[PDB]
Structure formats: structure tokens, C-alpha cells
Design a protein around this nucleic acid. Sequence first.
RNA 1: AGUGCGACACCUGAUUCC
DNA 2: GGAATCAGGTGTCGCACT
Length: 153
Amino acid sequence: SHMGDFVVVYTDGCCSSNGRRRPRAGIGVYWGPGHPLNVGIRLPGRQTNQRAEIHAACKAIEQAKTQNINKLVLYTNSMFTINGITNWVQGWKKNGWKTSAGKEVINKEDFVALERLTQGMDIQWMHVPGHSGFIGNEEADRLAREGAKQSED
RNA sequence: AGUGCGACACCUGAUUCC
DNA sequence: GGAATCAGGTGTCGCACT
Ligand SMILES: NCCCCCCN
Ligand code: NA
């Protein structure tokens, strides 16, 4: 039936050895089977699961704009990313980016970059279970892992 | 802030099986 | 590589008491 106005995308950020001596992080964006915009890229910068998860969503939005898409359904496993961008950020901006314990919000730069990207976009953030066997979740994850094998720069 | 709790991720190691 | 299982870790946030 119907057919809406949204285009669906699955993102994933992975980080092998997260919290260990040599973490390797990547981002993956999946637009559909064999879709030309699918990507698996090495994450530039500080290597962590949280940053990768947030930056995978940035990448999706960025690509979305590249195509004049402005009604996007973005699935991610990261409630940290969802809650951050759809809730915590409003408050952080009104309190000097401060944690529940008054400490500096660690991923400020990441959430700032993400919010800037959301401008002009009607994004519906949805959650997909990390262990979802759905093709979208697996491919995004597989893509992230492939990206993390790349070197930086 | 300290402590505790909650939550979603990301891992590392073993074992079974394909 | 993959279907699971068990141990243990960090990434990071909110919350409530002290
Ligand atoms: N439900 C308790 C989860 C604790 C996660 C600790 C991560 N450093
Ligand atoms: Na994920």
C-alpha cells in the first residue's frame, strides 16, 4: 500500500578493542542492498564506540543532504546517540555542556557536529537492536568493521 | 563531586557446533 | 567467516543520596 516520503538508512559505529590499548573504530552506513552509497570507513580521531556510533549517523545525514533528501528515517543501535541528539543536547546547551555530575560533557564536539548536520532535516531517529539479524543492521555493522581495517588520514 | 543505581552500545578471552 | 553460550572489561549518559 501507501508509500511515504521518507528514505530509510541504517548506521553503525564499531570499535574493536574499545577501552583497551589499541582501539580501531569504523562507521558504516547502509542504504539498501548493493546501494552505491553504502560505506565502511575508518573513524578519524579519538577511537571509541560512542564516537563511532555518533559519527556513523553524521555520515548518513551528510550523504542524505548530498542527495537533497530531507525526510530520513535513521536506525541506530545507539540510544546514547539518540537520547543525546533528541534530548540531552537541549539541556547541555542551556547549562554549559555539563554532565549530571557537573563534569564536562565528553562528546561535545561529536554532538555539536551532529546537531549542525540535523539542521534543515526532518529526521525520525529509530532504534534497532544491536543484535538484530535484520539485513540492515548486519550490513551496517559489517561495513563498519571493514572500514576499521583501513588506516587513518 | 563522591558513592550507588539504571540504560544502550562497543569489546577481550574461553567453550560447543557449522 | 558464521549459530550460540559463559567470564571479564570500557564508552558514556541520566538518576538519587551523601
Ligand atoms: N547495568 C550496568 C552497566 C554497567 C556498564 C559499565 C560500563 N563501564
Ligand atoms: Na552499534
